[PDB]
């Protein structure tokens, strides 16, 4: 009824939209360093 709407609204991904309205795939890299020993670190070079 009135004053009762779903909090989720759909995105309009039309191909005719502008550059700023284009669908961009965004990946977030979150880094957290605690006192625990590290398991993933920098890579190793393979020079000639």
């Amino acid at each position, epitope marked *: 009824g*009135f*004053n009762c*709407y779903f909090p989720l*609204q759909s995105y*309009g*991904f*039309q191909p*005719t*939209n*502008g550059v*700023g*309205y284009q669908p961009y795939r965004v990946v977030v890299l979150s880094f957290e360093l605690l006192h625990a020993p590290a398991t993933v670190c920098g890579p190793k070079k393979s020079t000639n």
Partner: antibody
Framework: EVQLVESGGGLIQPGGSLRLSCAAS????????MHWVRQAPGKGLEWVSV???????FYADSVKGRFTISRNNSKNTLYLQMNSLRAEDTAIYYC??????????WGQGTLVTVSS | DIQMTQSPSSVSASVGDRVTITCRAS??????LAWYQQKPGKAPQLLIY???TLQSGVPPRFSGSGSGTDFTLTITSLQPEDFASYYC??????????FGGGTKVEIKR
């Protein structure tokens, strides 16, 4: 079943501070998106500022500064404060509540005249 | 960033005519346009929203169909009561509204 009233309009100097008062009868002041649309006399409407349900607000490019929005949950009223005014600020504005990307509710308007 | 231009400004039509007001935007927007009707001396009111559906209280004479760039507010039956200005508004990602100029419909004389 909505009803919005406004008060505080009148004649004031450009070098002064003016506080508005927008009241909602069947609407809360912390649960909807509100827009302050101001329309010049003889011209079309123009966006000025927007406030969200939380503690966030936004302003346009021409009115980015000298603007403050502070809602009040005690008396269910909306307050807009204009610390600085210009000669082009005279117009008619309507406080309202709305959803995302569009607003449907509307309220009355108070005429303000600013001059020397 | 976005600017609003409306092709019609002052149009005259009879009772049995379509006003055919067109709305154009600088950048393509997909079905996020709403129309208004502000009478002189009266607070504005919404007519349609999202350019596809219709408000419950608004009579169903108003209609619109626009995909990305060209929008319209063709009316099947023009009534003497709804003689006011028309605006099409599009918002941004930060809820930045953008209202444009007024198109007025006057009775032929």
């Amino acid at each position: 079943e909505v009803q919005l009233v406004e008060s505080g309009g009148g004649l004031i100097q450009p070098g002064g501070s003016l506080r508005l008062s927008c009241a909602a009868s069947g609407l809360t002041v912390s649960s909807n998106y509100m827009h302050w649309v101001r329309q010049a006399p003889g011209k079309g409407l123009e966006w000025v500022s927007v406030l969200y349900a939380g503690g966030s607000a936004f302003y346009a490019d021409s009115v980015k500064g000298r603007f403050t929005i502070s809602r009040n949950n005690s008396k269910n009223t909306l307050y807009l404060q204009m610390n600085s005014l210009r000669a082009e600020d005279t117009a008619i504005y309507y406080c309202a509540r709305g959803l995302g990307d569009y607003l449907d509710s509307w309220g009355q308007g108070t005429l303000v005249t600013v001059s020397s | 960033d976005i600017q609003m231009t409306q092709s019609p400004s002052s149009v005259s039509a009879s009772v049995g005519d379509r006003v055919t007001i067109t709305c154009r935007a600088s950048q393509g927007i997909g079905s996020w346009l709403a129309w208004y009707q502000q009478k002189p001396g009266k607070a504005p009111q919404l007519l349609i929203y999202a350019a596809s559906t219709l408000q419950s209280g608004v009579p169903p004479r108003f209609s619109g169909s626009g995909s990305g760039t060209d929008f319209t507010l063709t009316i099947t039956s023009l009534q003497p009561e709804d003689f006011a200005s028309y605006y099409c508004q599009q918002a941004n990602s930060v809820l930045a509204l953008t209202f444009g100029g007024g198109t007025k419909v006057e009775i032929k004389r």
